[PDB]
Amino acid sequence: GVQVSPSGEKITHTGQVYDEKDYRRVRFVDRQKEVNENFAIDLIAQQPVNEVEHRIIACDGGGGALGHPKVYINLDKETKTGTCGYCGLQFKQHH
Amino acid sequence: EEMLTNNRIWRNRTVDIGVVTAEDALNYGFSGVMLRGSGIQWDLRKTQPYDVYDQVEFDVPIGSRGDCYDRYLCRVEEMRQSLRIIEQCLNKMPPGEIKVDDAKVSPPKRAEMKTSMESLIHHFKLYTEGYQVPPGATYTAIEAPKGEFGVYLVSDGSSRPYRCKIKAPGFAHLAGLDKMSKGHMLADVVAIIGTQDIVFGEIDR
Amino acid sequence: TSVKPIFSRDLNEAKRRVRELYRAWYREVPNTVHLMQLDITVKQGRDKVREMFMKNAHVTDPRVVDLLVIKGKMELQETIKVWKQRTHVMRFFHETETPRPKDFLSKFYMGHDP
Amino acid sequence: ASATRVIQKLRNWASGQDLQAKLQLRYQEIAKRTQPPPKLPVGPSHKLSNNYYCTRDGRREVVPPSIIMSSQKALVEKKAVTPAPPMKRWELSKDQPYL
Amino acid sequence: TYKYVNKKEQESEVDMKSATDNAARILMWTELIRGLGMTLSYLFREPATINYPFEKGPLSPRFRGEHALRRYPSGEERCIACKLCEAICPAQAITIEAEPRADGSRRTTRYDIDMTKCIYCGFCQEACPVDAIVEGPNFEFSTETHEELLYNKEKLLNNGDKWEAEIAANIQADYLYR
Amino acid sequence: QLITVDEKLDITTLTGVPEEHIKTRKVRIFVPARNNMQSGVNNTKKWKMEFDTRERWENPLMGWASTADPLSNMVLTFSAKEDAIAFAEKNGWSYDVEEKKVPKPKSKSYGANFSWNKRTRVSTK
Amino acid sequence: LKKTTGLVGLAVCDTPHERLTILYTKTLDILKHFPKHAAYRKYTEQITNEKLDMVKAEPDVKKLEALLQGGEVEEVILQAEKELSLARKMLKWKPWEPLVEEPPANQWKWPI
Amino acid sequence: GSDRSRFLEGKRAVEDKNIGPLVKTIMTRCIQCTRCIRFASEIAGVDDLGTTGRGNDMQVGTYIEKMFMSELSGNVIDICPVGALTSKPYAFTARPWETRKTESIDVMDAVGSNIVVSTRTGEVMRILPRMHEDINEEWISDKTR
Amino acid sequence: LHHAVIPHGKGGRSSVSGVVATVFGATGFLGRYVVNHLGRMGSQVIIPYRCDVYDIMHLRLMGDLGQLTFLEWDARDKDSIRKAVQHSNVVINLIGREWETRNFDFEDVFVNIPRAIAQASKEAGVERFIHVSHLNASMKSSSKSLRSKAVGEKEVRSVFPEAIIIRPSDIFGREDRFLNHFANYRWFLAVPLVSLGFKTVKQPVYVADVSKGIVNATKDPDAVGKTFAFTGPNRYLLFHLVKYIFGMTHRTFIPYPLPLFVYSWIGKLFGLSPFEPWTTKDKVERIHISDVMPTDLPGLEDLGVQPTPLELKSIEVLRRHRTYRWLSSEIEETKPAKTVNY
Amino acid sequence: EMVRKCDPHIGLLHRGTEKLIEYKTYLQALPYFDRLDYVSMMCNEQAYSIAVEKLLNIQPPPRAQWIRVLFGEITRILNHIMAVTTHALDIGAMTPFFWMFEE
Amino acid sequence: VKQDMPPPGGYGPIDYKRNLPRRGLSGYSMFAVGIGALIFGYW
Amino acid sequence: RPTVRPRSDVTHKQLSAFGEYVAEILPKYVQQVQVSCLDELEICIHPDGVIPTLTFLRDHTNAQFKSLADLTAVDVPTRQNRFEIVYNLLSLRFNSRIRVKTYADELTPIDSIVSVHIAANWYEREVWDMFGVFFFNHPDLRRILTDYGFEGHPFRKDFPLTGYVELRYDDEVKRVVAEPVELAQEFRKFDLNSPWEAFPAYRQPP
Numbered sequence A: 001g002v003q004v005s006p007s008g009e010k011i012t013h014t015g016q017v018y019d020e021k022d023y024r025r026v027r028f029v030d031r032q033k034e035v036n037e038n039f040a041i042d043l044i045a046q047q048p049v050n051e052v053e054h055r056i057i058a059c060d061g062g063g064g065a066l067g068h069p070k071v072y073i074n075l076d077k078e079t080k081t082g083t084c085g086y087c088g089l090q091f092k093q094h095h
Numbered sequence B: 001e002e003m004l005t006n007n008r009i010w011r012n013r014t015v016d017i018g019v020v021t022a023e024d025a026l027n028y029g030f031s032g033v034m035l036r037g038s039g040i041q042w043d044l045r046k047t048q049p050y051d052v053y054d055q056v057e058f059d060v061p062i063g064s065r066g067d068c069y070d071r072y073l074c075r076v077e078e079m080r081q082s083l084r085i086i087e088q089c090l091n092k093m094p095p096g097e098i099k100v101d102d103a104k105v106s107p108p109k110r111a112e113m114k115t116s117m118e119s120l121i122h123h124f125k126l127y128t129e130g131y132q133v134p135p136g137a138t139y140t141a142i143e144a145p146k147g148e149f150g151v152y153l154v155s156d157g158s159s160r161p162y163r164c165k166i167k168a169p170g171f172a173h174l175a176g177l178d179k180m181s182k183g184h185m186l187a188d189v190v191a192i193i194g195t196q197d198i199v200f201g202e203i204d205r
Numbered sequence C: 001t002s003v004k005p006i007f008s009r010d011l012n013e014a015k016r017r018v019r020e021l022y023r024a025w026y027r028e029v030p031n032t033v034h035l036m037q038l039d040i041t042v043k044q045g046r047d048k049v050r051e052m053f054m055k056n057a058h059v060t061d062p063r064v065v066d067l068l069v070i071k072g073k074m075e076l077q078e079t080i081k082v083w084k085q086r087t088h089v090m091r092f093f094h095e096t097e098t099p100r101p102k103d104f105l106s107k108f109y110m111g112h113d114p
Numbered sequence D: 001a002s003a004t005r006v007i008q009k010l011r012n013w014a015s016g017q018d019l020q021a022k023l024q025l026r027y028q029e030i031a032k033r034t035q036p037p038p039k040l041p042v043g044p045s046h047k048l049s050n051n052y053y054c055t056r057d058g059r060r061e062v063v064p065p066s067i068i069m070s071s072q073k074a075l076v077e078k079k080a081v082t083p084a085p086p087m088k089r090w091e092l093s094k095d096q097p098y099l
Numbered sequence E: 001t002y003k004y005v006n007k008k009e010q011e012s013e014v015d016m017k018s019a020t021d022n023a024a025r026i027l028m029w030t031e032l033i034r035g036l037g038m039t040l041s042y043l044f045r046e047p048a049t050i051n052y053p054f055e056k057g058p059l060s061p062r063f064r065g066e067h068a069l070r071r072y073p074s075g076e077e078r079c080i081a082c083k084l085c086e087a088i089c090p091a092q093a094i095t096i097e098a099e100p101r102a103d104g105s106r107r108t109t110r111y112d113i114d115m116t117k118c119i120y121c122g123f124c125q126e127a128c129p130v131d132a133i134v135e136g137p138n139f140e141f142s143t144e145t146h147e148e149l150l151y152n153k154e155k156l157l158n159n160g161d162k163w164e165a166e167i168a169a170n171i172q173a174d175y176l177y178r
Numbered sequence F: 001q002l003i004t005v006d007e008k009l010d011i012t013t014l015t016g017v018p019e020e021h022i023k024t025r026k027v028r029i030f031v032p033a034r035n036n037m038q039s040g041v042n043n044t045k046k047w048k049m050e051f052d053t054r055e056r057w058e059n060p061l062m063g064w065a066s067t068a069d070p071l072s073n074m075v076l077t078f079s080a081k082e083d084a085i086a087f088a089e090k091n092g093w094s095y096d097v098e099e100k101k102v103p104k105p106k107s108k109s110y111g112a113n114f115s116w117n118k119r120t121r122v123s124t125k
Numbered sequence G: 001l002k003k004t005t006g007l008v009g010l011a012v013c014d015t016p017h018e019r020l021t022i023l024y025t026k027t028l029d030i031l032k033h034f035p036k037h038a039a040y041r042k043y044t045e046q047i048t049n050e051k052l053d054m055v056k057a058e059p060d061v062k063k064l065e066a067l068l069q070g071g072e073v074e075e076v077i078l079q080a081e082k083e084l085s086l087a088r089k090m091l092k093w094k095p096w097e098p099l100v101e102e103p104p105a106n107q108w109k110w111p112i
Numbered sequence H: 001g002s003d004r005s006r007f008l009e010g011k012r013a014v015e016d017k018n019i020g021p022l023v024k025t026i027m028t029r030c031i032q033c034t035r036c037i038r039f040a041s042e043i044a045g046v047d048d049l050g051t052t053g054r055g056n057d058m059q060v061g062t063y064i065e066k067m068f069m070s071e072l073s074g075n076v077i078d079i080c081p082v083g084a085l086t087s088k089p090y091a092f093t094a095r096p097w098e099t100r101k102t103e104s105i106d107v108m109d110a111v112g113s114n115i116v117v118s119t120r121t122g123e124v125m126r127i128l129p130r131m132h133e134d135i136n137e138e139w140i141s142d143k144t145r
Numbered sequence I: 001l002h003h004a005v006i007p008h009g010k011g012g013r014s015s016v017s018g019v020v021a022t023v024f025g026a027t028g029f030l031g032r033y034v035v036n037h038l039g040r041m042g043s044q045v046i047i048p049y050r051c052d053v054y055d056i057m058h059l060r061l062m063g064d065l066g067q068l069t070f071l072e073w074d075a076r077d078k079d080s081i082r083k084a085v086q087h088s089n090v091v092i093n094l095i096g097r098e099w100e101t102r103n104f105d106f107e108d109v110f111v112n113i114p115r116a117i118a119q120a121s122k123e124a125g126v127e128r129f130i131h132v133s134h135l136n137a138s139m140k141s142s143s144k145s146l147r148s149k150a151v152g153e154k155e156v157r158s159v160f161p162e163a164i165i166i167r168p169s170d171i172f173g174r175e176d177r178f179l180n181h182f183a184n185y186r187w188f189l190a191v192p193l194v195s196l197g198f199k200t201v202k203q204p205v206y207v208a209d210v211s212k213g214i215v216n217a218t219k220d221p222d223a224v225g226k227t228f229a230f231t232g233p234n235r236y237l238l239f240h241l242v243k244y245i246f247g248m249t250h251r252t253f254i255p256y257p258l259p260l261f262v263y264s265w266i267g268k269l270f271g272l273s274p275f276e277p278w279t280t281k282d283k284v285e286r287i288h289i290s291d292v293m294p295t296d297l298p299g300l301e302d303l304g305v306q307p308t309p310l311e312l313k314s315i316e317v318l319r320r321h322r323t324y325r326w327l328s329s330e331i332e333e334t335k336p337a338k339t340v341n342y
Numbered sequence J: 001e002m003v004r005k006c007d008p009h010i011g012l013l014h015r016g017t018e019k020l021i022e023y024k025t026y027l028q029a030l031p032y033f034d035r036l037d038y039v040s041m042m043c044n045e046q047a048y049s050i051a052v053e054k055l056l057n058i059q060p061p062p063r064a065q066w067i068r069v070l071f072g073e074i075t076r077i078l079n080h081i082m083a084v085t086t087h088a089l090d091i092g093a094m095t096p097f098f099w100m101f102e103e
Numbered sequence K: 001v002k003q004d005m006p007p008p009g010g011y012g013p014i015d016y017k018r019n020l021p022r023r024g025l026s027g028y029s030m031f032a033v034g035i036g037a038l039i040f041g042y043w
Numbered sequence L: 001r002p003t004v005r006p007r008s009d010v011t012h013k014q015l016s017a018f019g020e021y022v023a024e025i026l027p028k029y030v031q032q033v034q035v036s037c038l039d040e041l042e043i044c045i046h047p048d049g050v051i052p053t054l055t056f057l058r059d060h061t062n063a064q065f066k067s068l069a070d071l072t073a074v075d076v077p078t079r080q081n082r083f084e085i086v087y088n089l090l091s092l093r094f095n096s097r098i099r100v101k102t103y104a105d106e107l108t109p110i111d112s113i114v115s116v117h118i119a120a121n122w123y124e125r126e127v128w129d130m131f132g133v134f135f136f137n138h139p140d141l142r143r144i145l146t147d148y149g150f151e152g153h154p155f156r157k158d159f160p161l162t163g164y165v166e167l168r169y170d171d172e173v174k175r176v177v178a179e180p181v182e183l184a185q186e187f188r189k190f191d192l193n194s195p196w197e198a199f200p201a202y203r204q205p206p
C-alpha cells in the first residue's frame, strides 16, 4: 500500500514522510528511496481464519523449531477472533 | 622443512641470532616458546593440562642452543606433534553433548525454547543480562602458540565483569628485543621479531 | 597530615624542581621548530609553555607538584626526541575548537551548558 | 588428473617423494555436501526425575576464600613446606628422541 | 616427554668417505639444488586459483554475512521488537524503537544495523526466538559510501524479501544443530 | 621522612577533564531506588554517583540520539556515603547527596483480616 | 662428565661436591647473625642441612640429582649462590620485625 | 527455580478483558496471587476485580464488563509482578534495560510525590514512583504517570 | 525554524546549525575551506560538482556522516539548478575561474551563472545568496573580468535583492594563485614586475578569514543586503610584497621591469595553453589594477573575524618553494616587509 | 647498520579491550578475545572460556573438551604457518607463504 | 536413531614423522664426473 | 558430579600450608594470606615491602617463583588506597602459581621490581599509562599504549568510555587534530544488574 504523499515521496509501513518544508529530502536527489511495497498490515489481512473445532488451540509458524514459540489462545469470544502476538493468524471455534 | 632446514642462507641467517640465555628468559617472562627453545622443559599441557590433554600423548619439542633456528625447529616440529594429536582427537570422540548441561550458564536448544517455558526464560536472560558469576579472581594461563596466554578475571556478583586483564605473550617477548638485538645488525634484527611469534593485537590491548 | 612525601619535602624544595623544568623547555622550543617544520615563530611557542605552567599554579600540595613535573619530563623527553609530531605539539594550541563565550548571555544562545 | 604420467615422474623426482597420493587439490575424497539430517543426543539430566538443580548447582557451591594470618581478624620443631611437590625430568620421547 | 631437535654433534672421527660427502655438499652447494628441484616440482602442478566472479569459492550454510529480516510464509514481518537482539549485540549496533502497529499487533517502527558496526558474530540470529533477524550468506555488498552501510529496516526487509529462497534452505539445514 | 599538609587533597589536575567537567558539572550520590515492578531490593545497597544529563540531539541522518558530553553514562558503585563525598570533593566535582530511604518495619498479622470488631475484615477471603 | 647441558649460557662449572658445599656451609655462617627466633633462619637451615647431607654422602652426580630435586645439578649451584645472596639482603633488611607497620584501612572486603 | 520443564501436557488460556485504556489485560499469564484485589479493596476502596471460579478455571477479574477507572488504577501495573495487566500507552515502546532512570518529583498535584522518570535516548517512556514513606507511600496517581 | 533546522547541538562535527547550504564553487580553492568551516560546526552542505568524482574526494571528509551530499550539473541547462537550491536556507556563490575557456567566458561565468542561480534560487524561496565579487571591481577597470564582475553585482541585486555580496582582496593560502604565482617566477631568469613594483598597493587576505567571514554572514540577523569587503591589515606595496616572498623563499630576487606593452602580451603567449595557463591577458592586469583604500564598508571585524597578517602565515604557503639549505629558516629570520598607510 | 639501542613504541594499535569487557557481559565479551591473537583465535576463546568456568565451578562435557582441544591445535597449525613463513618474507623466501595459504 | 557426529573404527595411521630421503651420486662420482669433464675440456 | 568441576582437595592444603609459611617467616608487611576454592594462593602485603617478598620468591629454595606473568592494577574507588596492584608468579620447579597484591592511592607510589623481575619494565609503564601509579627506581617510565599527548589515565573508572577528545583531519591546517568529543549514537548504558543476591551467605551483612 505504498501511496505517494502530496509532496511526492512514498509512505512506509509507518507514516514517516518528510514534509514539503523539510531540508532532509536532498539525500534522495540523484537517488531514490528504498521502501518495501509489501506491507504486512495487509498481507496478514489477506489470510483466512482457521475455523477450528476446539476452544483452546495452538499456533506455530510451520515448524516448532522453525518459528513461533508455541502459545495457546482462548476462543470463547465468538464476536472477535483470537490471535497470536507473534504471527497475526486468526482462529474461531465453529460452535 | 626441506627448503629451509638444510640451506646455508637460512642456516647462516638465523643461527647465532637471539642467543637469549636460559635464566634471563624467565627474568624477562617469555614462558611460551622463547624459553623451551633454550632448553627449559616447560609446557602447560604436560604440566597443567586444562582441557583434555591428560589423555593425549605427544612430545614437547625442546632445543638447546636457542638461536632463532633451534626454536624454528621447535616451531616446525610442534606443528607435527599437534598433527599427531589430530590423529587422536579424531579417533576418540565420545557421542555426548556439546554445551554445558546447565541452562542458567549455557542457553538451551533453539527448539527446546519453543515447547517449554523455562528454556524460553533463561534464553531471555542469558542473551540480555548474563548469568551472575560469583565474585572471585583467577589466572588461566594457556599455551597458545605464542605461549602463556593469560587472563586475570576479577568478578563481582553482577553479570558484567569487573576488570578483566590479558597477559600477552609478546608483551614480554618484545621487551626481549633489546638484549637479543645486541651485536646484531639491521638485517637480522628483522628476523628476531619473527622469532617471537609477534602479533600486535594481544600486546597493544 | 603526616602523609608520605615523594621526590621532595615542603613545597619550597619542590619549586626549584619546577624551575629546573622551565629551565629545559625555554632552551628547546627553538630546537623543535627547526627540527620539524612549524609555523610558530618562537614567542607564541614559548608563551604557551608559560600558559601551561600558569594553569596549575593554584596547586598547594608538594606531592602533586612533585608529580606534575614528572609528566612534564615525559612530554619533554617526548619532544626533545621526535617521538611526538607536528600534530601532537601543535595540539596544545586548540586552534580548531572555537573558544566558547565565558559570558552568561551568549552561553545559552547556544546550548544548555551551565 | 592433469598429469599425463610423464610429469608425475618428473614432479615426483624433482621433489624426491610421491605426491600423486598426497596432493592438496581435493577432488572427490572429501565429504560431500547436503549431509543427511542429524538427531543430536540430549545430554544427561534430561531424565525427568532426581534432577533437582539444588544438587547440581556448581555455581553456588562456592564459598569465600579461607583467610590465613589476617592482621586484625583471624591471627592464626616445625617442618618446612613447599607450595607443591616439585616437577622433575619428565621422560625422553621414545620413537623419535633426536629430531 | 621432550624431544631434542638440534642435538647431534659427536665427533666420530669422520672417515674420508664422510668428508667428500661433506666436501661435495660444499663446492657444489647441492643442498640448495634440492630446493631448486623442489620449486620445479610446483610449476608443473595445477595452480589452485579460481576465476573469482565465475568461480566463487566454497561456503557452508552457516556462513554469516549480510543481515536480513525474515518473514512468515503469509507476509507478517517476523520481528516482534523484543530488544534481546541489541541487548546482546556487543558492537552496540541496533536500535529498534517500536509501537503497536494500529492493528493491535506488535511490530517495529524502527530497526537498524550500522554495518560499519556489526562484528558479524551471530548473537542476534541465535537469540531471536522467532528467526526474524538472520545473517545471510552475502559477502559481495561493498559500497562506495558510508551511508549505504546504515541498513535501517526497508533495506533489510526487502533484503530478506530477496534471499529467503536461499536463507531457508540453510536454516532448514541447520535447525537441528542449534 | 613524613610530611604534613592540611590541604583539601585536590586531584583536579592529574586527570585531564579540561575545564567544563570540573565546575560546570553536578554530581548526585544516592542509593538507587527500587524498580517497583519487582520486589527486588538488591539493586539498592550501593551508593552510585550518577551525574546530570545534558543535550541529546537527534541525528539528522538517522534518528540516533547523539551527544558531546561523554561524562553522562558514568555510574560508579561504592559501599558507603563517607567514601563517595571524599571522592568527588577530591576530583573537583560538586556533590548533592540524597540520604538512604529504608522502609519502616510494619506489624503485619494474617489474622487482622478476620476480625470481629475491626475494619480490616477483608473480603475475597 | 657432562658434555653439553640442555640449557644455554649455564656453563658446566665442573668439580661439583665442592661449590655445592662451599655455599651451603657459607649460608650456615651468614646465618647465625640473624635471631634464632626469626623463622627464616629456622627454616632454610632445615633446607641446606638436608642438601648438604645429600651431597656429603652421595658422590655420584646422576643419583644425587634424584635426591635433591633440581635436576641438572649446575642449576642448583645457581640457586645455592642465590639464596646465599638473599640472606645478605634479608640481613640489612629486618623482615622478622613485629606485626605490620600501617595495617590496612578496610582494604580487602572484595564484593563492591 | 529449576532449568528444565518436565511439563509436556498442554496449557490453558484465559479470556481477556477490556478494563480500560490504561490497563491492558493479558490474563493467560496471571498466576492468581490476589495482589490486585487486595489493592482494589484496601487502598482504592473499589471491590471489583474478584476471583471467579475454582481450580485452574479460576480467573481473576470482573464477572461482567466493567471499567476499573479510578485514581490509583495505574498502580495495579506496578504491583502485578507478572506482566498480565500492564500499561497500554507504554505497551511496546521500550524494554527496561534500554532505559535510563532519573529520580525526580511529581508536579500537577500539591503532594510533591516522588518519581522515577525513565528515559530512552533523550525521550520519556514511563513515569514510575519512588518509595518514600511520608509522601504517598509507595505509589502514584494516574494523572502523573 | 521548521523543527530540524533548529540548532539543537553543541559545537559541531555531529551537531546541527540550520545552515543547509549550497556552495557551487566547492571544487577549487576557496570552497574547500568553506565546506570545512560549515561541516566542522555541523551543517548540511550541498556541493554541486560539474567535474571529476576524483577531484571531489577531499570534500568527502570535512563532513559528519550525511551532511555532505553531492550532485551533478552544468551551467548550460535548467533543472540542474532547480534541484540543488530546492531544499536550502542558504546559497553561496564562489564560481569564477581566472580566464576564458573555449565555452565559458568571463561574461558566461561572472554574470550569467549568478543570474540564473539567484533567479532559480529566489523561486525556491531561500533567504540568503552570499555572492563573491572581487574588490577593485567597480566599473571602467583596466581588465575584462572586473568590468564584468560588477555586472554580476548588479544582475544579482536586480534578481535576488537582499543578497550579501563579499568583495574580497587578492587571497593567499596553501595552493593559492597569488603567492604561488610570484613564487614560480623563479623558474625564469627573474621577476618581470611593472614599474619596479611600485604604483601597486595591495592588502591581501587569508582564506580562513574569508571563509570564517562567510560562515558567520549566513547566521547573523545583520547582512540582509550589506555589502562587504574582506581586505585584511598590512596594506603592503608590491615590490616589498614580493621581496618578502623571495626572502621567505630564499632563492633570489632581482627585478626586470617592463611596461604593459609587452608584459600583457607575454600573457597572450602563455594564454595559448589548452591547460590551466600560467598567465593571461588579465591575470597580469589584476596584479596592477590592485589599488584601493578602505572607505566605509563593514569588513571582517564587524562580522566575526579578527583578520590575520601575512607576516605570520607565510611559512605554510612558501615552505615548499625553498631548497634544502633553506628548508628550515624560522620567520624570526627574514626581515618583515615595509607597510604603507597612505 | 649495527644496532646499539632500540626503543619500540608499541601502542599504535591500542584500542582498550581491557576497559570494554568492563561494560559487557561474559558472552558479550567472548569475541574480543579472538582479536588479541588474531592468528590463534580459538586458543584465546579456549582460555577465556575456562577462567569463566573456574569462577562458576563448572566443567564442560567431554565431547566439547575434545573438539575444544581439536581446534586448539588446529590454531596451532594456523599460526606456525603464519610464523614460519612471515619470518621468511622478512628474510626473503616468499614461496612457502603461498604454499601454505592454500593449505 | 541418534547420530551427532562420531567417527568410525580406526581411521588408520597418519604419517607425521619426518622423511627426507637422501639421494645423489655421492661424493666421488661428483668430482670424477667433474674433473673428467674438465680434463676433456683441456684435451 | 558431572557438571561442577571437582574441588581436588589435595592442592588446597599444599598452598594453605605454604601460606602460613610465607607469613610466619615474614610477619612484616604481610596480612591475610588467603587461598580460594579455586586452588590458588593470595598474599596481600604492605607496599613498603614489595621487593623483600619478590626477591624472596625469586631467590629461595622452596619458593622458586623466578618467572613473572602479569602486573595489573585494579581500581576500587570506595577505599582510600583504590589501586590494588596484583602480581602473579610461577614456579617451573613446583608447577604452582601465586598472587601477591598490594594497594596504593592516586598518590602513594610503589617501588619498582625491575631489578628483581626485568619483565616488569613495561608492565609498570602501562600501569603508569593506564592508571597513574608512579614507580620509584624505574628505567624510563613513560607511556606505551596511549597517544603522545593523551591527558588522562584511561583505565581509571573515573575516565569515560569514549574519553574527552577524538581526532580528525582539518584541511584548513592539514593535520589530524583534536576537537572535543561529539558522538553520533550515545553509547547506551544498559541496566543489566538484577536484584536477587544469587549467592546467599556469600554476601554483605550490615
Ligand SMILES: CCCCCCCCCCCCCCCCCC(=O)OC[C@H](COP(=O)(O)OCCN)OC(=O)CCCCCCCCCCCCCCCCC
Binding pocket: B008, B012, E026, E027, E028, E029, E032, K035, K038, K039
Ligand atoms: C685435474 C687436475 C687439475 C684440476 C684443477 C681443478 C680442481 C677442481 C676445482 C674444483 C672447484 C669446485 C667448485 C668451485 C666453486 C665452489 C664455490 C664454493 O665453495 O662456494 C661455497 C659457498 C659456501 O661458503 P661458506 O661460507 O663456507 O658456507 C658454508 C657454511 N657452513 O657456497 C655458497 O655460499 C654459494 C651459494 C649461492 C647459491 C646461489 C644459487 C645459484 C643458482 C644456480 C644456477 C644453476 C645453473 C648453473 C649455471 C652455471 C653457469 C653456466
Ligand SMILES: NC(=O)C1=CN([C@@H]2O[C@H](COP(=O)(O)OP(=O)(O)OC[C@H]3O[C@@H](n4cnc5c(N)ncnc54)[C@H](OP(=O)(O)O)[C@@H]3O)[C@@H](O)[C@H]2O)C=CC1
Binding pocket: I024, I025, I026, I027, I028, I029, I030, I031, I050, I051, I075, I093, I094, I095, I096, I097, I098, I104, I108, I109, I132, I133, I134, I135, I168, I169, I170, I171, I177, I178
Ligand atoms: N582565489 C583568489 O585568488 C581570489 C578569488 N576571488 C574570487 O573568489 C571566488 C572563488 O574563486 P576561486 O574558487 O578562488 O577560483 P577557482 O579557480 O577555485 O574556481 C572555483 C570554482 O569555479 C568553478 N567554475 C568556474 N567556472 C565554471 C563554469 N563555467 N561552469 C562551472 N563551474 C565553474 C570551478 O569548477 P572546476 O573546479 O570544475 O573548474 C571551480 O571549482 C571567485 O569569485 C573569485 O573571483 C577573489 C579574490 C582572490
Ligand code: SF4
Binding pocket: E078, E079, E080, E081, E082, E083, E084, E085, E086, E096, E127, E128, E129, E130, E131, E132, E133
Ligand atoms: S530478537 Fe528477533 S523478533 Fe525480537 S526484536 Fe530482535 S529481530 Fe525482532
Ligand code: SF4
Binding pocket: E085, E088, E089, E090, E091, E093, E094, E113, E117, E118, E119, E120, E121, E122, E123, E124, E125, E135
Ligand atoms: S552479527 Fe553480532 S555484531 Fe552483527 S548485528 Fe548480530 S549480534 Fe550484532
Ligand code: SF4
Binding pocket: H029, H030, H031, H032, H033, H034, H035, H036, H037, H060, H079, H080, H081, H082, H084, H085
Ligand atoms: S496481581 Fe497480577 S498475577 Fe496477581 S492475581 Fe492480580 S493479575 Fe494475577
Ligand SMILES: [Zn+2]
Binding pocket: A059, A060, A061, A068, A084, A085, A086, A087, A088, A089
Ligand atoms: Zn503464531
